[PDB]
Amino acid sequence: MRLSYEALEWRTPIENSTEPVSLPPPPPFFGQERAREALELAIRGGFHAYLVGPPSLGKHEALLAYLSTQSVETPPDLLYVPLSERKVAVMTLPSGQEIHLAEAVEGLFQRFPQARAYLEALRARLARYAETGEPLDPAQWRPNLLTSSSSGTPPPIVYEPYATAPRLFGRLDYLVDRGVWSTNVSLIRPGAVHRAQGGYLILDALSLKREGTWEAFKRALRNGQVEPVTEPQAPAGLEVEPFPIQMQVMLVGTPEAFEGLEEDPAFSELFRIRAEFSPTLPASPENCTALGGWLLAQGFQLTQGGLTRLYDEARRMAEQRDRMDARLVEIRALAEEAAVLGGGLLTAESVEQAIAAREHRSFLSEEEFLRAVQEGVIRLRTTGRAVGEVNSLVVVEAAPYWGRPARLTARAAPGRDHLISIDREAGLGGQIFHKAVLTLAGYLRSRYIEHGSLPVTISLAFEQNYVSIEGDSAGLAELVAALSAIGNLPLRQDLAVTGAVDQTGKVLAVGAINAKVEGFFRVCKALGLSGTQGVILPEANLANLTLRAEVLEAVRAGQFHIYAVETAEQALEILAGARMEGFRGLQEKIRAGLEAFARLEEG
Amino acid sequence: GGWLLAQGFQLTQGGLTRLYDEARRMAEQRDRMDARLVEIRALAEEAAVLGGGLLTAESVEQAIAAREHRSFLSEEEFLRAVQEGVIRLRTTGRAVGEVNSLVVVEAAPYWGRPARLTARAAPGRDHLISIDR
Amino acid sequence: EAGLGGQIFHKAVLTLAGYLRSRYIEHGSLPVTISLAFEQNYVSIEGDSAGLAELVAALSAIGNLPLRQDLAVTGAVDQTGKVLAVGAINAKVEGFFRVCKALGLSGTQGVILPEANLANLTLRAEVLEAVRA
Amino acid sequence: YEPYATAPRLFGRLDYLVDRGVWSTNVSLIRPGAVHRAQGGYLILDALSLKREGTWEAFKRALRNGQVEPVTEPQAPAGLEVEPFPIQMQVMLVGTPEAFEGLEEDPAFSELFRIRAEFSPTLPASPENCTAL
């Protein structure tokens, strides 16, 4: 089937492009109902949770926004007290109240029923010092206030991106009078774990791993072992007793950052709630409106047409007409470049020109390729007809993954049923490429059985390919090339072909469908559009087609053509300009080619 | 049931029964129950939250459901691709040489999916080829 | 077969076999075994640029065709027998000139190379002058 | 332009005065690094040095969090806490396609370095470029 301009057009119409947008900020987590409901459960139950999803989604900013709205009772005052001259413990008092115990002890269970054991040791040390005149000192006997707060709204929220032991657990300072002797409860500094008590600690999975602090952090959550970091020099140490941990931990990372963590049984034991962000959102009017209120709240001056183009670019990023890329950070970075080109205003033009300039900045490799094609250093045809030859479509393996035609040939000779991919046999293909080749051999042998086994050897080669080639998306082009070589069928060179094929000859969806189409357009355009060029591609990719403006306009002008197909025979009928049956069709020509090869193979 | 009460839960009969049957299903054995009490307890802690502090039959079934929802992104993507025709599956009609086989995805929690499998036969000299192998 | 070629070298060889078998089909499959060897090569050899020389050598061996030794040959070939551009085209030409010159120019020496390399030919003065002479 | 991207050259250094042991804090013994000298203007670093010196992760923390820590010694019995500050500078990184390679696999590299300024290995051979040369 031919795809008309009206069937291909996917973009949002724009009314009143330059009108300023005015819209309220959406809720944190809009379109991310899964992660939002997981984290509501984690907050309601006190469970630790881990936020997982691709980079640049805005997972951290959304979490910090959502935590800001929570309320907890005002966190206890938090402190270290000595239990001896070599030993300390972390304790809580009700809020604002260590100021009264710090002054009371400045009188060097009074009214503080919790400070039980620090008092015994203060008294006991006062005791044995009357009882010896046993010196000062200095005093290292008074409480150390780690934290205190005026209220629990919002709760404490501590995001520590750099998860080193002294940042998580705190640090011992050493005073030097003589050697490096310097204990005292009062030279201990708190870490993030101390600052997060009563509230939330947010850490990045990748840092716990890089910093090697995952095992110590497990010990903190499981045993309350929180040890401030010591130095190799100190001739004695303080013993630091464990304490009851009161905090909820949120870990944030990509599916890949979590990977090593997940193999640890204790990770799933400790982080029971997975809050997974989707890489895309529904492409709906509600999410277009939310994205508009989110950009205004980020400070942009947005027009309707600027919003609409950003929203449609997010759709094209997702390669899904009905879904939009969910990565708000990436939409924001694109809007920042557009804003500069619009002199501070985010307009439809400034977005389209920002998109273009990103392409220009990564286009050197394609400028080299197109110059080699034009100079005749790379041999490509984009017009005329040839037997056994087809423009297949490939994507270059470096970002941003431009598409290009790759000329592919099939040659057939009389022989004992072999379908050879030269590139596979040379070691250039990967496993999925090799699979696609075997799959085509399966199709051909089972489709053409009147001679017994196929009387031909067929070899397929990508003509000027120097690098490894992967995936199954050249299957349709290889099978049509092979059927053409068998029946001697001239094929149009103005149509490139992409599509995977199964054993039954059905055409399956491929990846990067927009880059492939546009890569064939760019080459046809650089060589001068003939009016009849185009691409045959899988019907199964219609949910993914979000073609750039220049392509849609050429198709609307009649200067480029898109065909979608379900079976490899439908592709062959288009390329060979004839029907398989109504015979004199192509099928009769294929069987007559195989009869001719069969006669050559038996004298 | 006496172990969960001693752990401090407020349990109803129906909450106990659903936990016990979920432990059976965890073991994939109608006559055996999963022996991991810590895992039963973690599931009861989530159920208790959904039951507002009471562990009931509904709060257990809804805790089980919400664990599935929390790990379901990969299946939501797969089912959308099937519905959009990006993955080609048939669940009705008849075809020669074709069958829906069943596979498990290799990441936890190991969802199951159909995998369409085809066999093609041609005249030849006794070879059974798995293309994937 | 000895393991000296890399993958692209091996590709060029398979590509020539593809050309020969499909070009000469009146006997059925080709009635010949052809072996190609670089005579005194001790190191690994890479790339596709000896394809044209190997295919002409092979066609010569098949038809018993004496070939001029005063012309060196460089060029890749596709399955259809078309000649493709190669790398280092100036160093290759000049290397054949230097050897012809060290052995005494006969007046008839030269190189056959791909038309597709004409955008790359920037030959040294001494070569241009010999061709002008 | 700091070609040698070590931690003390990017972030500065603590000196220690010795009266007794190694006690020597004071705000006034802190020396600035390139990051301090570039405020309000431009810092130019080589990709290959950030990698060789292992300072890429710390440099990311500087750009993302304003964490700029002068380098300390293993000896110092106490330390100064250095608060982060608002970074005001534009960074240009310079390198070959190969020098960038490892950096590019890091998502945070593309987040932080949004503008690629890629030089072509050749120019048009025109009268204008002959005159410019």
Rounded Cα gap, residues D51 and D57, in angstroms: 9
DSSP reduced 3-state for C71: strand
Rounded Cα gap, residues A272 and A46, in angstroms: 11
What is the sign of the dihedral through the CA atoms of C47, C52, C58 and C61? Answer: negative
Given an 8 Å threshold on Cβ–Cβ distance, is D77 in contact with A364? no
Q: Nearest-CA neighbor of B120 among A446, A428, A601, A470? A: A446
Rounded Cα gap, residues A130 and A143, in angstroms: 22
Name residue A410's beta-bridge partners. A460
Rounded Cα gap, residues A159 and A192, in angstroms: 8
Rounded Cα gap, residues A439 and A422, in angstroms: 16
Tell me the domain boundaries of chain A.
Answer: 2-283, 284-361, 362-603
Provide the residue type at C86 as one letter.
V
Rounded Cα gap, residues C53 and C51, in angstroms: 6
User: Could you give the angle at which helices A285-297 and A304-318 cross, rounded to 10 degrees?
Assistant: 120
Provide the residue type at B70 as one letter.
R
Q: Does B37 touch chain A (CB under 8 A)?
A: no
Rounded Cα gap, residues C5 and C8, in angstroms: 8
In eight-state DSSP terms, residue A540 is G
Q: Percent helix, strand and coil across chain D, each rounded to 5?
A: 35, 10, 55
Question: What are the φ/ψ torsions at residue D92 (nearest 5 degrees)?
Answer: -120, 130
Touching subunits of C (3+ CB pairs, under 8 Å) are A
CB contact at 8 A, A506 and B87: no
The CA–CA distances, whole Å, from A290 to A56, A350, C41 equal 18, 21, 69
Q: Which of C11, C49, C82, C106 is catalytic?
A: C49
What is the sign of the dihedral through the CA atoms of C47, C49, C53 and C54? Answer: positive
CB contact at 8 A, D52 and D1: no
Q: Nearest-CA neighbor of A334 among D64, D114, D63? A: D114
Task: List Cβ neighbours of A506 (8 Å cut-off, separation of 6 or more).
Answer: A566, A567, A568, B88
CB contact at 8 A, A89 and A126: no
Q: Nearest-CA neighbor of A508 among A439, A406, A444, A431? A: A439
DSSP reduced 3-state for A434: helix
CB contact at 8 A, A126 and A118: no
Instruction: Return the CATH number of A362-603, one of 3.40.630.10, 3.30.565.10, 3.30.70.260, 3.30.230.10.
Output: 3.30.230.10
Tokens linked to A11: 């973009």
Tokens linked to D31: 């020396």
H/E run at residue B22: helix B13-27
Q: Which residue has the tokens 């390729």?
A: A369
Task: List Cβ neighbours of A519 (8 Å cut-off, separation of 6 or more).
Answer: A393, A395, A402, A403, A404, A405
Rounded Cα gap, residues D51 and D105, in angstroms: 13
Touching subunits of B (3+ CB pairs, under 8 Å) are A
CA-nearest residue of chain D to A188?
A: D78
Rounded Cα gap, residues A299 and A345, in angstroms: 11
Cis geometry, peptide bond prior to residue A137 (ω within 30 degrees of 0): yes
User: Which of residues 316 through 375 in chain A touch C, CB cutoff 8 A?
Assistant: 375
Q: Nearest-CA neighbor of A64 among A155, A151, A149? A: A155
Task: List Cβ neighbours of D56 (8 Å cut-off, separation of 6 or more).
Answer: D50, D103, D106
CA-nearest residue of chain C to A421?
A: C14
Given an 8 Å threshold on Cβ–Cβ distance, is A413 in contact with C25? yes
Residue A432 CA to its chain's centroid (Å): 23
Rounded Cα gap, residues B127 and B131, in angstroms: 12
Indicate which of D17, D56, D114, D119 best probes the interface with A, i.e. most A CBs within 10 Å of its own CB: D114
Q: Does A417 touch chain B (CB under 8 A)?
A: yes
Given an 8 Å threshold on Cβ–Cβ distance, is D111 in contact with A364? no
Given an 8 Å threshold on Cβ–Cβ distance, is A423 in contact with C11? yes
Tokens linked to A180: 């490096």
Task: List Cβ neighbours of C44 (8 Å cut-off, separation of 6 or more).
Answer: C4, C5, C6
CB contact at 8 A, A315 and A323: yes
User: Could you give the angle at which helices B57-70 and B37-50 cross, rounded to 10 degrees?
Assistant: 100
Given an 8 Å threshold on Cβ–Cβ distance, is A417 in contact with B87? no
DSSP reduced 3-state for A130: helix
Tokens linked to A155: 């709760």
Provide the residue type at A438 as one letter.
L
Given an 8 Å threshold on Cβ–Cβ distance, is D21 in contact with A180? yes
Provide the residue type at A271 as one letter.
F
Residue C48 CA to its chain's centroid (Å): 9
DSSP reduced 3-state for A150: coil
**CATH no. for A284-361:** 1.10.8.60
Q: Which of A95, A392, A459, A473 is catalytic?
A: A473
Rounded Cα gap, residues C52 and C67, in angstroms: 14
What is the sign of the dihedral through the CA atoms of A461, A462, A463 and A469? Answer: negative
Closest-CA distance of chain A to residue B76, Å: 10
**Whole-angstrom distance between the N-terminal and C-terminal Cα of chain D?**
25
CB contact at 8 A, A188 and A144: yes
CB contact at 8 A, A82 and A275: no
Indicate which of A447, A502, A539 best probes the interface with B, i.e. most B CBs within 10 Å of its own CB: A502
**CATH no. for A2-283:** 3.40.50.300
Four-point Cα dihedral A55, A61, A64, A69, nearest 10: -130
Q: Does B45 touch chain A (CB under 8 A)?
A: yes
Question: What are the φ/ψ torsions at residue A40 (nearest 5 degrees)?
Answer: -55, -50
Cis geometry, peptide bond prior to residue B34 (ω within 30 degrees of 0): no
Note if A435 is an active site residue: no
Rounded Cα gap, residues A342 and A336, in angstroms: 10
Rounded Cα gap, residues A188 and A112, in angstroms: 23
Task: List Cβ neighbours of A57 (8 Å cut-off, separation of 6 or more).
Answer: A277, A279, A326, A327, A328, A329
Q: Does A549 touch chain B (CB under 8 A)?
A: no
Q: Nearest-CA neighbor of A93 among A147, A48, A47? A: A147
Note if C106 is an active site residue: no
Cis geometry, peptide bond prior to residue C2 (ω within 30 degrees of 0): no
Rounded Cα gap, residues A56 and A254, in angstroms: 10
Spell out the SS3 assignment of A50-88. EEECCCCCCHHHHHHHHHHCCCCCCCCEEEEEECCCCEE
Rounded Cα gap, residues C85 and A299, in angstroms: 55
CATH architecture observed for domain B1-70 = Orthogonal Bundle (1.10)
Q: Nearest-CA neighbor of D56 among D86, D115, D101, D88? A: D101
Closest-CA distance of chain A to residue D77, Å: 5
In eight-state DSSP terms, residue A409 is E
The CA–CA distances, whole Å, from A591 to A456, A596, A600 equal 12, 9, 14
Helices (H), D3-114: 7-11, 34-37, 47-52, 56-65, 101-104, 107-112
Tokens linked to B115: 């995998």
